[PDB]
Short mmCIF file of C-alpha atoms in Angstrom, two decimals:
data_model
loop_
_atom_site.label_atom_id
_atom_site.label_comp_id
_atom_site.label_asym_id
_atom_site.label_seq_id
_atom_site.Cartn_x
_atom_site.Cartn_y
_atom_site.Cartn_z
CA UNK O 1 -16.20 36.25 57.94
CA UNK O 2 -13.42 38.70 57.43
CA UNK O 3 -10.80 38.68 55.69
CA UNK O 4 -7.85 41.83 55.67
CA UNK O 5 -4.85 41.27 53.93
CA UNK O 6 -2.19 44.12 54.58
CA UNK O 7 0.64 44.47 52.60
CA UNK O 8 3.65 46.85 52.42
CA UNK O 9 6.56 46.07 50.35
CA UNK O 10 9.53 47.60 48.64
CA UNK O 11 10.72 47.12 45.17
CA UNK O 12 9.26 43.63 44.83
CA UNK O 13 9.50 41.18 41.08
CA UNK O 14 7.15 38.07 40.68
CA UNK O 15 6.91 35.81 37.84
CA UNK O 16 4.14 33.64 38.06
CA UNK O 17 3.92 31.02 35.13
CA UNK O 18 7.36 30.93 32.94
CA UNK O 19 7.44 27.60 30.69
CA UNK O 20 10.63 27.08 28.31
CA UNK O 21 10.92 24.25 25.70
CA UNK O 22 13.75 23.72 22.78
CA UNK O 23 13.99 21.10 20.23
CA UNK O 24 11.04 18.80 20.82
CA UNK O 25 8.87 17.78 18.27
CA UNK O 26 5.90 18.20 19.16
CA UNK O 27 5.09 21.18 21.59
CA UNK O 28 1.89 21.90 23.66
CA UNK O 29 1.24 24.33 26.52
CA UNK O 30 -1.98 24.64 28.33
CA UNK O 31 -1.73 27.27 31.07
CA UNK O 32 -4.83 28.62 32.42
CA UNK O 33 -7.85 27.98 35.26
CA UNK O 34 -7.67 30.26 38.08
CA UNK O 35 -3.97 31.47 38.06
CA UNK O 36 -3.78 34.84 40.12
CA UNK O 37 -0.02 36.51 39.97
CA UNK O 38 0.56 39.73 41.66
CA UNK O 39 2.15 41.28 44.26
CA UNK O 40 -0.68 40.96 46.58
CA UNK O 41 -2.08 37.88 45.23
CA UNK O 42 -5.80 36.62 46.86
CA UNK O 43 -8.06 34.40 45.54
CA UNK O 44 -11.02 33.85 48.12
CA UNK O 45 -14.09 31.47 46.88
CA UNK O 46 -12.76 30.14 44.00
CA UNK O 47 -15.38 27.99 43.34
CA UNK O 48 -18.44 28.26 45.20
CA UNK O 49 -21.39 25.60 44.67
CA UNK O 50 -21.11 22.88 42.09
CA UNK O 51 -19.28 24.58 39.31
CA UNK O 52 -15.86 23.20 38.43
CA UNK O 53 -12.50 25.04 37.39
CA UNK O 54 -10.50 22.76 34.86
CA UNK O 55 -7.06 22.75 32.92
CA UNK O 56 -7.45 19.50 31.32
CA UNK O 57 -5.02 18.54 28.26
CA UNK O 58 -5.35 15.72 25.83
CA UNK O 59 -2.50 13.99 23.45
CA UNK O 60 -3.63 11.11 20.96
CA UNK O 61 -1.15 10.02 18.64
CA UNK O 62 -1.26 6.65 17.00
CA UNK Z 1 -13.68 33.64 61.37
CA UNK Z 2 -11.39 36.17 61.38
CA UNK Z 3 -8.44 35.95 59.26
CA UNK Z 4 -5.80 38.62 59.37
CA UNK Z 5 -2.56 38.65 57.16
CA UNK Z 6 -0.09 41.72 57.64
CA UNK Z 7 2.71 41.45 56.07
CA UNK Z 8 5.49 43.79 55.91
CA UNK Z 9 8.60 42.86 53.27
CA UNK Z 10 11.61 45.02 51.34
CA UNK Z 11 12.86 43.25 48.02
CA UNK Z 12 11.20 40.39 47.20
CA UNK Z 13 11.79 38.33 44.16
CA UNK Z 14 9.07 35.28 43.86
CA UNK Z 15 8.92 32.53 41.32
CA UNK Z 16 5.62 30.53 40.94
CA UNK Z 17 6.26 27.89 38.86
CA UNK Z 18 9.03 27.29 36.19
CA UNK Z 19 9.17 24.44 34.07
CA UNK Z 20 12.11 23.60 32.01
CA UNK Z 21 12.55 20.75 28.90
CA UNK Z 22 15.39 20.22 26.42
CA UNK Z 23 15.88 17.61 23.55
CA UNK Z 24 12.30 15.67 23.70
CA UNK Z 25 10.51 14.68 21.31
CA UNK Z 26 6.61 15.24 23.26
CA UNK Z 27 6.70 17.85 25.56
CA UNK Z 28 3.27 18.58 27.35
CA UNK Z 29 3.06 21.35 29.60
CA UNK Z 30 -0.12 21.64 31.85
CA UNK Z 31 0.34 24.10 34.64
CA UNK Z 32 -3.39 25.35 36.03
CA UNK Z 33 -6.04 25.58 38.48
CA UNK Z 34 -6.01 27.85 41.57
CA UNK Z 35 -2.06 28.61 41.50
CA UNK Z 36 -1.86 31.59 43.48
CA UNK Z 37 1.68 33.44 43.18
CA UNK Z 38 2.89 36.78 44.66
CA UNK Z 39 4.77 38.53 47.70
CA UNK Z 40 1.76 38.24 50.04
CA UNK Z 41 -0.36 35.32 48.57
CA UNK Z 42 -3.55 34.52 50.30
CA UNK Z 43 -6.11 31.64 49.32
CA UNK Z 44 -8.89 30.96 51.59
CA UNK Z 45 -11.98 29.07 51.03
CA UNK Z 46 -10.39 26.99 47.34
CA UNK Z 47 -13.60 24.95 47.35
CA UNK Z 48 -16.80 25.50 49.08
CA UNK Z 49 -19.74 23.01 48.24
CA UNK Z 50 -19.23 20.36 45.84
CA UNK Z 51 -17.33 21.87 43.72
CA UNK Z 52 -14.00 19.95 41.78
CA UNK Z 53 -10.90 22.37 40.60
CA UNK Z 54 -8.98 19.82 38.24
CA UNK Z 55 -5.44 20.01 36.43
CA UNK Z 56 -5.24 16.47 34.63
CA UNK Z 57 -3.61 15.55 31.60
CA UNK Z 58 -3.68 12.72 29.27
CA UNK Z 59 -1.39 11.02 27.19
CA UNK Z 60 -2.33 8.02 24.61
CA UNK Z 61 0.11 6.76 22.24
CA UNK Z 62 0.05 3.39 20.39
CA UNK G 1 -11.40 30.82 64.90
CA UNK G 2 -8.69 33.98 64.73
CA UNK G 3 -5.84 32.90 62.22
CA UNK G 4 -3.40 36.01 62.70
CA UNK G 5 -0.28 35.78 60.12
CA UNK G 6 2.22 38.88 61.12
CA UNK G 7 5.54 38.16 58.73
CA UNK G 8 8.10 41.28 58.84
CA UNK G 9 11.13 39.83 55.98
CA UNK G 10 13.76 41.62 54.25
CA UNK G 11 15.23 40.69 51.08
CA UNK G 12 13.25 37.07 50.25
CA UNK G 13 13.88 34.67 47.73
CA UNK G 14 11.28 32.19 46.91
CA UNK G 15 10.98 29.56 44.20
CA UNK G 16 7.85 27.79 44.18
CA UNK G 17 8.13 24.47 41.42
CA UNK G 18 10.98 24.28 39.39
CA UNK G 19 11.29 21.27 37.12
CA UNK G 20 14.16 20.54 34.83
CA UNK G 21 14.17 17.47 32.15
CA UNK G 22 16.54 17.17 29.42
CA UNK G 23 17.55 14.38 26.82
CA UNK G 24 14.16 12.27 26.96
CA UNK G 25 11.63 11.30 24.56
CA UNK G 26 8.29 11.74 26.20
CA UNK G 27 7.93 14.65 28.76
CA UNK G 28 5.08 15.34 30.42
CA UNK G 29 4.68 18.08 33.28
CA UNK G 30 1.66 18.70 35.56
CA UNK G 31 1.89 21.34 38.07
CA UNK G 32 -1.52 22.88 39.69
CA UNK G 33 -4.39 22.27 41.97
CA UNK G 34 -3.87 24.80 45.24
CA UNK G 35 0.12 25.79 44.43
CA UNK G 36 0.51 28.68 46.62
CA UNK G 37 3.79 30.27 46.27
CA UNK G 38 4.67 34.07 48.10
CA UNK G 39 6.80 35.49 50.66
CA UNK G 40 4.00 35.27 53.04
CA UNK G 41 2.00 32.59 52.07
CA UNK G 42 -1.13 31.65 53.74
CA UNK G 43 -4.30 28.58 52.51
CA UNK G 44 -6.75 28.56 55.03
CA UNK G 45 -10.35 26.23 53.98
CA UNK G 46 -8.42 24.73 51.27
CA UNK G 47 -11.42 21.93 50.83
CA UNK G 48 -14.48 22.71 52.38
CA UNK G 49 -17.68 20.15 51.85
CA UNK G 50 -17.34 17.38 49.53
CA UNK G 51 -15.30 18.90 46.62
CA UNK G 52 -12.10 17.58 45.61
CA UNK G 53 -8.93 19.17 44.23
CA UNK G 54 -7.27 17.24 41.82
CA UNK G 55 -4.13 17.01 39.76
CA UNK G 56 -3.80 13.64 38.05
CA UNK G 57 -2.00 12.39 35.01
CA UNK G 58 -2.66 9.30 32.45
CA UNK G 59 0.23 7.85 30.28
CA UNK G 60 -0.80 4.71 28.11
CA UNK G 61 1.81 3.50 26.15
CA UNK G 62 0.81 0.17 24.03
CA UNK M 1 58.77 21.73 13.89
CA UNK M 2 55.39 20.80 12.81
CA UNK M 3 52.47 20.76 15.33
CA UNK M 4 49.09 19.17 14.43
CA UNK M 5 46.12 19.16 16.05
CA UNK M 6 43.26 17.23 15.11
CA UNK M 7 40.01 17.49 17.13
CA UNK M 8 36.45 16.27 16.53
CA UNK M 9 34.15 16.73 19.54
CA UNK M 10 30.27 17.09 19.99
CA UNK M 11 28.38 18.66 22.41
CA UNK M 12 31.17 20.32 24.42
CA UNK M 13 30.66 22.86 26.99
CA UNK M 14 34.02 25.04 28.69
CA UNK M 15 34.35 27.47 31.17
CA UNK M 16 37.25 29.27 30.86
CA UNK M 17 37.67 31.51 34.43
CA UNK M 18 34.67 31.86 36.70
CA UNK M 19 35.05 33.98 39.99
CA UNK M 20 32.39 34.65 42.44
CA UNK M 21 32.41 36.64 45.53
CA UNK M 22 29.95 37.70 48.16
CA UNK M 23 29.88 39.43 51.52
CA UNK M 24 33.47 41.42 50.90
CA UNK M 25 34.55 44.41 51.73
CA UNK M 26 37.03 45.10 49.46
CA UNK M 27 36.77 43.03 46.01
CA UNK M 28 39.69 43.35 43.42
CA UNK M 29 39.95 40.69 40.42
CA UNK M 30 42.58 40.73 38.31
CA UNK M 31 42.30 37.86 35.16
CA UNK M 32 44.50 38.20 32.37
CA UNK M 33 47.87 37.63 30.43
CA UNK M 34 47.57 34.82 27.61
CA UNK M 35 44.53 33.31 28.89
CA UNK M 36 43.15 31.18 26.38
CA UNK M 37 39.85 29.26 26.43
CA UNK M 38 38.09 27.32 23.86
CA UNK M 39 37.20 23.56 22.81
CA UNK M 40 40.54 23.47 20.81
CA UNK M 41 42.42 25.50 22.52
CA UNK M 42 46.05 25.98 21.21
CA UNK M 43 49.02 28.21 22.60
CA UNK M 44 52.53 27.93 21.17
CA UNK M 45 55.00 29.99 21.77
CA UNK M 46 53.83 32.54 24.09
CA UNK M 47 57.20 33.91 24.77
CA UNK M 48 59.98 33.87 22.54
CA UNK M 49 62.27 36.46 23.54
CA UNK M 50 63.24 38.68 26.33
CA UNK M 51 59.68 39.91 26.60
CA UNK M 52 57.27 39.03 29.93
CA UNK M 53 53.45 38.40 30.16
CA UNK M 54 52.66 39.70 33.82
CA UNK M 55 49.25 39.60 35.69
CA UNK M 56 50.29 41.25 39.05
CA UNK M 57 48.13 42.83 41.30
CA UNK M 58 49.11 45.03 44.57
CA UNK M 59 47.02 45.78 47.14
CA UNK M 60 48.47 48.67 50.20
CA UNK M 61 46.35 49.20 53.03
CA UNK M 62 47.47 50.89 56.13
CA UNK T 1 57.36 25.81 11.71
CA UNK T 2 54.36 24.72 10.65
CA UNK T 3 51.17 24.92 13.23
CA UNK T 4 47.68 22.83 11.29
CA UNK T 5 44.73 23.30 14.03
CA UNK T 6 41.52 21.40 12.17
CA UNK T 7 38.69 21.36 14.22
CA UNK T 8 35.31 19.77 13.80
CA UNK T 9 32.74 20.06 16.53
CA UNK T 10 28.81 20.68 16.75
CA UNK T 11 27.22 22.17 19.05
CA UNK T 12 29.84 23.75 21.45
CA UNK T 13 29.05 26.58 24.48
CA UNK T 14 32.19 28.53 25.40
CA UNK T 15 32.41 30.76 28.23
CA UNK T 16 35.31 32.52 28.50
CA UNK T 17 35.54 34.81 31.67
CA UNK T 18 32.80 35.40 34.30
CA UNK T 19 33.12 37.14 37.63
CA UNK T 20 30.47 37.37 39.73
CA UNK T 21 30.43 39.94 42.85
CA UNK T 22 27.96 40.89 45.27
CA UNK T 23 27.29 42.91 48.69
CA UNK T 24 31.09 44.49 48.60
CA UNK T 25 32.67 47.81 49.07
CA UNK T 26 34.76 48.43 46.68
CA UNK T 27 34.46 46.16 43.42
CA UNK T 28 37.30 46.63 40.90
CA UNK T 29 37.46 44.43 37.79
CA UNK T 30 40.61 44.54 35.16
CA UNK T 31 40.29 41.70 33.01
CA UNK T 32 42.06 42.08 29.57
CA UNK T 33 45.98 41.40 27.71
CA UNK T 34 46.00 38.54 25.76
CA UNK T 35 42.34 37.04 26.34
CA UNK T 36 41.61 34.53 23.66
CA UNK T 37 38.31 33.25 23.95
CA UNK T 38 36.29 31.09 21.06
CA UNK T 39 35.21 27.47 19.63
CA UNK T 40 38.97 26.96 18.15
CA UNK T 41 41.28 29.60 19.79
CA UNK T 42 44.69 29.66 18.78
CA UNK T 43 47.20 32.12 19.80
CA UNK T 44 50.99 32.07 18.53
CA UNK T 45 53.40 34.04 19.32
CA UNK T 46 51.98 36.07 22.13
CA UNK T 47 54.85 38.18 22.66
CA UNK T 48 58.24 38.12 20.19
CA UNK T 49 60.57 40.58 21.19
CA UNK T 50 61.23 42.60 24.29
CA UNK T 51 57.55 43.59 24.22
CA UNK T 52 55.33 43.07 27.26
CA UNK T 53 51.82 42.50 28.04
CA UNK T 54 50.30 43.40 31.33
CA UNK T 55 46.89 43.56 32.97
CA UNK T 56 48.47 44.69 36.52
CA UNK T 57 46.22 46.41 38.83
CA UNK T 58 46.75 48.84 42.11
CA UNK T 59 45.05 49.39 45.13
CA UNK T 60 45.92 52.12 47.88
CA UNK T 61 43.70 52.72 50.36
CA UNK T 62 45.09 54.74 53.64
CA UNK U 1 55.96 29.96 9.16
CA UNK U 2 52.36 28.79 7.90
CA UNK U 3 49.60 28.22 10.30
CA UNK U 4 46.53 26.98 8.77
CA UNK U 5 43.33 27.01 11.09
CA UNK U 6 40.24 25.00 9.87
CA UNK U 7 37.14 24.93 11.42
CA UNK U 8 34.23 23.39 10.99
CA UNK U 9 31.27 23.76 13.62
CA UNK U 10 27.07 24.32 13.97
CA UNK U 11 25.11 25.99 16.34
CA UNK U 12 27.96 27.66 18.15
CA UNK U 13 27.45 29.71 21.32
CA UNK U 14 30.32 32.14 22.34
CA UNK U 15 30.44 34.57 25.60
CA UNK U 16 34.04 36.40 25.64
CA UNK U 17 34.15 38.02 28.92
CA UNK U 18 30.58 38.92 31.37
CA UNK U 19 31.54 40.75 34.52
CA UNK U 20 28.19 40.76 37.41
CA UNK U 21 28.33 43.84 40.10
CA UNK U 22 25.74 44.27 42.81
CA UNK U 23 25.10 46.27 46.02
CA UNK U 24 28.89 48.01 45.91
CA UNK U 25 29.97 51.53 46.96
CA UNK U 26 32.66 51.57 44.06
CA UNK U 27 32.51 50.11 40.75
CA UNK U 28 35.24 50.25 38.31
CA UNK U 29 35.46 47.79 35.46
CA UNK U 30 38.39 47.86 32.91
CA UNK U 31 38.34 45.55 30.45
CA UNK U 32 40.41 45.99 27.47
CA UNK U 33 43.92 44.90 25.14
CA UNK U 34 43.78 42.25 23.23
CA UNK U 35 40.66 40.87 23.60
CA UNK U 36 39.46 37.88 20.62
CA UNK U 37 36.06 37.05 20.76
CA UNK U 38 34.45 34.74 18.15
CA UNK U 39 33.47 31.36 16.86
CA UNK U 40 37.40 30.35 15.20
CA UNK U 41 39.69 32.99 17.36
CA UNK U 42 42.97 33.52 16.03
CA UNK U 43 45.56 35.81 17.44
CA UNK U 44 49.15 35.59 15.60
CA UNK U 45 52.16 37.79 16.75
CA UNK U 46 49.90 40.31 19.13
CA UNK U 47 53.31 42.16 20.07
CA UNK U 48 56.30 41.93 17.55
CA UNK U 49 58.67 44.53 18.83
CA UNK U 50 59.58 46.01 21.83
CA UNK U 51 55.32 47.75 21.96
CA UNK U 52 53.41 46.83 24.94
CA UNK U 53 50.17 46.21 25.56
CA UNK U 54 48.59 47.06 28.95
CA UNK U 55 45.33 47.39 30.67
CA UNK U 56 45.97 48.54 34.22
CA UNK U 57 44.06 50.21 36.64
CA UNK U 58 44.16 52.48 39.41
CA UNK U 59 42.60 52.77 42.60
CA UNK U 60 43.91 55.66 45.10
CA UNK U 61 41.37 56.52 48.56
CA UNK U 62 42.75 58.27 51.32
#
């Protein structure tokens, strides 16, 4: 297995994850895992075998 | 398995993800797991085996 | 199995997940799993074997 | 003479002049004079004479 | 002459002048005179007299 | 001649003038005069007489 990854770019803007809140009450952000952000962005085997990636959120309110 | 990516670009401007919340009163943000941004993103092979890449959220309110 | 991706742009605007809410009372956002977002973009073996990519949500209200 | 005004808004949003232009070759904007903009936006009187408000614009090309 | 103006708002976004260009030439921008711009704006007697305002603009291009 | 201006606002949000250039050969911005910006704008008698108030421009290109 091969894999090339060429790139050739120019003058090049990434934003990968951008969240916005304003008046709420209550205010929870969970960002996270395996999040790759680049310009040359690669993510090859993430998960390999029985192993688990998770970005799990819990909220009890009564 | 060969897999070749060439990729040749001139001002790029990329967004991943962008969430956006105003007058709530819960706001729960969960962004996560293999979220791959850029100008040349490449994701091969996410899961191999038995693997499990997960992004859930809960919410309980009584 | 040759996957050849050859991608010559100029001047590319992408926006991957945009979400927008205003004026509610409960707002919950789940973005994730395998987002890929680029100018060239390129999954390839996303699931391989007996894994599982997931990106659920729970909302109990009583 | 007596003017009154009596205003009681909420949440009000105004845009006074917006312009927007793309793929020109030559580009001239010319805004002015007694614009007025606002969410109680009174104007008496703008004139009271012999005087002139002008917002001319001259374009020559030969 | 009397002129009362009583205002009462909450919360009020005022945009007054906005001009946008883009992939031009020549770009020539002459905004200005009497430009009022606020959340109560109130303009008497602009001109009283032989005054004058202008915002004129020229172009010559052989 | 009385003129009485009462305001009463919150969380006000106020953008006078906002000129945008991109990708031009020539860029010539004049902005100028009697330009009131604010929350509670109030312009009384801007030219009482036989003044004047200009905000030309020029543009000569043989």
């Amino acid at each position: 297995g091969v894999l090339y990854v060429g790139s050739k770019t120019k003058e090049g803007v990434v934003h990968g994850v951008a969240t916005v809140a304003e008046k709420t009450k209550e205010q929870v952000t969970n960002v996270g895992g395996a999040v790759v952000t680049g310009v040359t962005a690669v993510a090859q085997k993430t998960v390999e075998g029985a192993g688990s990636i998770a970005a799990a959120t819990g909220f009890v309110k009564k």
